[PDB]
Amino acid sequence: NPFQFYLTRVSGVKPKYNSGALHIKDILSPLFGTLVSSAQFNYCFDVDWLVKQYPPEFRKKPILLVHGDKREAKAHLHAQAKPYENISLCQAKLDIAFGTHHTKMMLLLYEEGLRVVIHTSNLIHADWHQKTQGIWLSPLYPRIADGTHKSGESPTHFKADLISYLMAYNAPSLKEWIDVIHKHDLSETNVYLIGSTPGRFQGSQKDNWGHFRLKKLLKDHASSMPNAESWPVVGQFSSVGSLGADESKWLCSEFKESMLTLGKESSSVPLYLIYPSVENVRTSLEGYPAGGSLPYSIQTAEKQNWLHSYFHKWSAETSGRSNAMPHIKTYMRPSPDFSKIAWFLVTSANLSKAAWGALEKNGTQLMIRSYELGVLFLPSAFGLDSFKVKQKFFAGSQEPMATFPVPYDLPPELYGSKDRPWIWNIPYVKAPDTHGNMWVP
Numbered sequence: 001n002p003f004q005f006y007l008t009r010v011s012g013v014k015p016k017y018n019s020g021a022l023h024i025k026d027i028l029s030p031l032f033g034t035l036v037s038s039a040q041f042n043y044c045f046d047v048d049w050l051v052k053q054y055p056p057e058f059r060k061k062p063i064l065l066v067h068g069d070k071r072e073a074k075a076h077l078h079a080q081a082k083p084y085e086n087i088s089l090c091q092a093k094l095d096i097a098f099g100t101h102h103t104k105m106m107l108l109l110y111e112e113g114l115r116v117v118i119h120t121s122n123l124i125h126a127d128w129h130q131k132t133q134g135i136w137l138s139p140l141y142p143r144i145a146d147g148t149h150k151s152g153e154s155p156t157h158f159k160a161d162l163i164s165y166l167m168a169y170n171a172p173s174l175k176e177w178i179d180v181i182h183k184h185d186l187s188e189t190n191v192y193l194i195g196s197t198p199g200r201f202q203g204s205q206k207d208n209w210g211h212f213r214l215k216k217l218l219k220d221h222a223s224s225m226p227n228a229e230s231w232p233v234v235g236q237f238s239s240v241g242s243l244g245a246d247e248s249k250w251l252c253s254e255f256k257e258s259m260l261t262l263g264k265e266s267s268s269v270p271l272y273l274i275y276p277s278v279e280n281v282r283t284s285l286e287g288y289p290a291g292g293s294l295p296y297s298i299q300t301a302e303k304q305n306w307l308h309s310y311f312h313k314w315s316a317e318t319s320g321r322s323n324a325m326p327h328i329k330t331y332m333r334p335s336p337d338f339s340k341i342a343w344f345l346v347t348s349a350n351l352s353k354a355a356w357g358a359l360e361k362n363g364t365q366l367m368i369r370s371y372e373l374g375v376l377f378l379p380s381a382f383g384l385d386s387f388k389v390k391q392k393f394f395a396g397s398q399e400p401m402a403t404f405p406v407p408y409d410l411p412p413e414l415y416g417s418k419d420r421p422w423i424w425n426i427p428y429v430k431a432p433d434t435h436g437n438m439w440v441p
Ligand SMILES: O=C(O)c1c[nH]c2c(-c3ccc(OS(=O)(=O)F)cc3)cccc2c1=O
Pocket: 043, 102, 121, 122, 292, 293, 294, 295, 348
């Protein structure tokens, strides 16, 4: 299949729903390549666990952990890694307040070439156990022959764009990986990179990151269809930031406006937001503890109750994952009957200004607090005008090269009158979860 979009394995679902899913041990297996060195970009690390996920024969190969921790948290991470002489650390600079290093990426250097993995999971046991998570697996990129001068670039500009994302760190350990990438041929890449890095971007740089990067790609590489105002936007996420006192402050002004861009020419567009309800979490495989990774605070939620009228339940019968709480984040543009999509994005970016960017300085500057990373699937990059939605995520469609594996159910289902968004820092003591427990934070 052309897309190479996977879900992580979920412990407890029938084998039918894990055939074609990937565990981290699968990704790092010798079948994927003979490891020489790796870089693990992430937010949260269990280093003891992480090293055990590498094949025994590769566990002494150099590993670079790219993180955003400071102060005592940084010291804790160093103490975790101190046992392992092959592990180095890179602290990503976070010079804007309230920013976080959220990017989830593996750079896997092999004897045979190079692989890039962009995904949504923390490097801890629970994120790969019973959650819905997304993975994009690059092709095996071959090395460019010594003395041969070629770009190794793809029609989506992925090689230069990935180097640009890494250059933003200004870090010597990542310059080494930039030089590795320069030496490899990434021309088979058929996805567009969408990154966020911290900063205040003006002029040309405004289109480099965040929701303006998405807008630029949609303007340049998608085309508008008749009745485009009827094609909904779907956003699906595991955390919600403070979006303002009403929908015009950010969500339905600049964020939705970027998401609804198609083509170069010049709103009724339905907006579906998918976020687990309390009932989704209670009845999940993990029970209420799944809510420890759905960090929506009561202090934030009580300031924006207008937002919850946009909220739709998590449902994933198509992939057998309705009870596997989402830590994947996805954004897409389905047709009015949800049978086709104009594009699909899998990313680390939640529904927040910190992740996507907020306009400043009279609309001339995009300010981003965090590192985020995702990949965009555009029909034009596959010789298509749209993607047909795959009916069953793990099935065998009559045209796999035109049929995109959307991992949750369409159309999304609106919250009922008795549903509430999962809010992690208030108690739930009215009905027990699948393990027999209440939630008392
Ligand atoms: O992107 C990611 O993978 C994640 C990022 N953050 C998470 C948090 C969290 C949120 C806010 C915060 O900051 S705080 O509210 O001010 F204390 C500290 C931790 C808590 C649980 C899971 C995740 C997570 O999974």
